[PDB]
């Protein structure tokens, strides 16, 4: 039901945290990096930088009470945190 998604365009803090942790995990696995290196050996710092300018290729599946769900691309979501 992508048309008329009834959930917020803003990224709730839990998604921010989980996305950051995940992306850090993949980076630690030597996964491809999508931005230039300024020396942040910290995978998690790479993760915050990545999120700031929207190169995360992840989409959040939000579950409604009934089991139906919406898909929000991280690019679509508003990072207000």
């Amino acid at each position: 039901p992508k048309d008329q998604r009834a959930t917020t365009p803003y990224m709730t803090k839990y998604e921010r945290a989980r996305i950051l942790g995940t992306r850090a995990l993949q980076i630690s696995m030597n996964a491809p990096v999508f931005v230039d290196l300024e020396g942040e050996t910290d995978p998690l710092r790479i993760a915050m930088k990545e999120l700031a300018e929207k190169k995360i290729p992840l989409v959040i599946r939000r579950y409604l009470p009934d089991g139906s769900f919406e898909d929000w691309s991280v690019e679509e979501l508003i990072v207000d945190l």
Binding site: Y14, E15, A17, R18, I19, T22, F34, K55, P57, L58, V59, I60, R61, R62, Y63, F69, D71, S73, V74, E75
Partner: protein, 112 residues
């Protein structure tokens, strides 16, 4: 009407001690005790005697007495509770686990 009176009554107790609690935390409790169409206490005979998953119920104050009932009725826990997933050691459906993370391969192929 009873719900409102119950809230008002409890407020006196909390206020009497000079402490302060937000209305949100307080009203929720009052609401929960009446959602079942009655003054459901939070003792063994109230909240416990709900229709929630037995595996959750068995950890309140009575364990074996509840398990036996599950077998009698062949209960089917939904695992939507938090403690239920704790026992199984699975990610609870809350907080960071109240949703799912999916890889938008379309966006991936968008970024070269």
């Amino acid at each position: 009407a009873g719900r409102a009176a119950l809230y008002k009554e409890v407020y006196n107790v909390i206020a009497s001690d000079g402490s302060y609690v937000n209305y949100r935390h307080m009203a929720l409790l009052v609401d929960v005790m009446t959602t079942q169409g009655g003054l459901t206490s939070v003792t063994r005979h109230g909240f416990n005697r709900s229709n929630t998953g037995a595996l959750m119920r068995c950890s309140f104050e009575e364990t074996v007495e509840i398990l036996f009932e599950a077998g009698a009725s062949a209960e089917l826990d939904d695992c939507r509770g938090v403690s239920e997933n704790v026992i199984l050691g699975q990610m609870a459906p809350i907080g960071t686990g109240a949703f799912d993370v999916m890889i938008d391969e379309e966006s991936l192929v968008k970024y070269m």
